């Protein structure tokens, strides 16, 4: 068969209800049993079974998860969506072989805006020994996700050779964190002074700034 999940992404504030759908190409229902399953794959773990045979709950998964449906149309309800469910959701039929999955519906929990705590790091001694220099900035615990960092080197000289990586949504508080690595050669790190990490995020017109001066080289 082939399973179609909508929405592909979803954001719902706490206490709300979220409704993942899943429609099949064919009636995955033989007699009164809808052969479909629902899995929660948190950010970087294996899948956790939530519901089997469309409605039955897996022991342990809390009762705010509900599965409903017949034939072609199926639905997972999560209410109240608590911070802990910021994960990706799959449905799988087992009506026939092969056992196909639907594409995944990501849930993103809406939350109040939170501004970043920027941190700036020199390169290690060990790195410079390999002839290279990395300057690292952790922009941590902000919401929403959209942030754009800039590297200012020595004067309002900007740079390229930047690596930027975002963590997925934290399951305790619904924040994001970011890592930005400017990677220079030692032999050019060495002949400059100021390195700024200037972050610009919704919570202020003013970019946040962290910066260090190469201190006794």
């Amino acid at each position: 068969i082939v399973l179609t999940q909508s929405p592909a992404s979803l954001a719902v504030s706490l206490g709300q209800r979220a409704t993942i759908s899943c429609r099949a190409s064919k009636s995955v229902s033989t007699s009164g049993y809808s052969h479909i399953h629902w899995y929660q794959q948190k950010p970087g773990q294996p899948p956790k079974l939530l519901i089997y045979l469309a409605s039955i709950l897996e022991s342990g998964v809390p009762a705010r998860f509900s599965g409903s449906g017949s034939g072609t149309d199926f639905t997972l309800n999560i209410h109240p969506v608590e911070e802990e469910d910021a994960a990706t959701y799959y449905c799988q039929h087992s009506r026939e072989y092969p056992l196909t999955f639907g594409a995944g519906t990501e849930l993103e929990l809406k939350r109040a805006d939170a501004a970043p705590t920027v941190s700036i790091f020199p390169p290690s001694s060990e790195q410079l020994t390999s002839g290279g220099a990395s300057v690292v900035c952790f922009l941590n615990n902000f919401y929403p996700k959209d942030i754009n960092v800039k590297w200012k080197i020595d004067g309002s000289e900007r740079q390229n050779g930047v690596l930027n990586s975002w963590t997925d949504q934290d399951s305790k508080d619904s924040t994001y964190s970011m890592s930005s690595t400017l990677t220079l050669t030692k032999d050019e790190y060495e002949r400059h002074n100021s390195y700024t990490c200037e972050a610009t995020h919704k919570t202020s017109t003013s970019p946040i700034v962290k910066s260090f001066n190469r201190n006794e080289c």
Binding site: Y33, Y97, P98, S134, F212
Partner: protein
Amino acid sequence: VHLVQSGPGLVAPSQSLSITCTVSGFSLTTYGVHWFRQPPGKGLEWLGLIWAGGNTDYNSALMSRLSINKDNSKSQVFLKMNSLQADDTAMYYCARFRFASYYDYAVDYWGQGTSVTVSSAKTTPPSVYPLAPGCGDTTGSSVTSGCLVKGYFPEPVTVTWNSGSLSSSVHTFPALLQSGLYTMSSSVTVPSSTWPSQTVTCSVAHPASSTTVDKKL
């Protein structure tokens, strides 16, 4: 460990793969084992099932290229995949099949997975560089520290703080393929005490190369 698979790392194209799934807390005498894989960033995919009585069902597609076989006494299922292509790069998971009757079954427990990268390249160990606030500011009551892990191949890597004791305020920034190699980083925030003379450490274990280096900050 309830289900754990080993098989791993880098396997060059056209060669064969065997991932061994070791079950615990049940026996193959009574339980089926599915194999699934997840190709990086996209959907989960079913490979096949070996039922209780050593019986097998395969995803007609991969069909020709794989076999699954159990040694009931040893509590291991083994998946043999031959003529590896580069899109078989995937996370490989083994899962338990609780079957009671056609109206009550579940794919209920999942293995952690193992990462298999099909490519003609050679593994490359990471370089680990500690990142500590170096220009002295009276860092409040919390300080951030980081570990930068650079240039490894293939994935995965595991970065733990003081061997696993601190996994409180640990952020793990996902990995970025840069020029054929991966880089990643993790930050931890500890109190302004639990840093200086408490001595922090990230322990990076890069399986494929059998690197397990601990860098002291």
